[PDB]
Design a binder for these strands. Structure first.
Ligand SMILES: [Mg+2]
Ligand SMILES: [Mg+2]
Ligand SMILES: [Mg+2]
Ligand SMILES: [Mg+2]
Lengths: 154, 153
DNA sequence: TCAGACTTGTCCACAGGAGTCAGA
DNA sequence: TCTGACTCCTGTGGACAAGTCTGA
């Protein structure tokens, strides 16, 4: 478990509240138990001109990747264990996205228990809904009621 | 001259580098000596549904204002003296806009000497170009060359 | 099977100016 | 004469999703 400097976390929190994104998704997964697959993503977006800034994040956080998409680049972290480690330390300093951060951590922690009963999996899918609600969601398709539709059918 | 807490300045620098803006403008003015005036602006933009965040920023900074326009709100500060003191303290923590901040500080400090010679004023307007060059400028009109043309009269 | 690397798409929520105006 | 408040606007540079595919 990596320990991060406080001044680094304080600046980064401000930058994340601004140009960052804490994302919780429910993805279609045919080769799956409940035909769905949870996905948690911490993301920092920046113009490719300033990709160097995102590249530094990979070294400073110790994990994650940088991908290009159009005229824009993104730092990307979805691996659960270091994500949980990173968000735990970052959370006390977030102002706009603190609740999204806490919800993701909660999803991550109660993740294996959710992969038992279909009811518990659906309860966490509602936690995912709340994250999307807190964000400025605009193109969401798969929700908890989408899961329930494929759940109450079988 | 107020002195800001370091943790506040560290978070703020992050949010400024992300959703904020450091703007230098050359505005036409028929009443002024060189037909152009300078305006420096510290800007923080956010959606109106989060105007409260900008409202807190007014209280914490202790100066500036919040304006609305559409579904988007803005904290802004153009008053030179508090701007200089604010940017002086924020500067060392900035990463993406550190240069813009230093140029604004430089412009402010050379403002009295700028109202003396046209060449020196052009030099200051040149510094305004650099800030715009550092920003993601897309709708800029009046530049130092605009001043050069007018000065040639 | 399944988390995790990586791509593509859309709609803004920003950034970064342009102006005008009152009062100093 | 001169500054700062204040409004309006463009053109993105973000945000927040949607997805494919693979290795063990
Ligand atoms: Mg933002
Ligand atoms: Mg919302
Ligand atoms: Mg930004
Ligand atoms: Mg530029």
């Amino acid at each position: 478990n990596t320990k991060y400097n406080k001044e680094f976390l304080l600046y980064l929190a401000g930058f994340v509240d601004g140009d960052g994104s804490i994302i919780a998704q429910i993805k279609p997964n045919q080769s799956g138990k409940f035909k769905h697959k949870l996905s948690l993503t911490f993301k920092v977006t920046q113009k490719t001109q300033r990709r160097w800034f995102l590249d530094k994040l990979v070294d400073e956080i110790g994990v994650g990747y940088v991908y290009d998409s159009g005229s824009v680049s993104n730092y990307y972290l979805s691996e659960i264990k270091p994500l949980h480690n990173f968000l735990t330390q970052l959370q006390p300093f977030l102002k706009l996205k603190q609740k999204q951060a806490n919800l993701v951590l909660k999803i991550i922690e109660q993740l294996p228990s959710a992969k038992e009963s279909p009811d518990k999996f659906l309860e966490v899918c509602t936690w995912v809904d709340q994250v999307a609600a807190l964000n400025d969601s605009k193109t969401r398709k798969t929700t908890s009621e989408t899961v329930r539709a494929v759940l109450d059918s079988l």
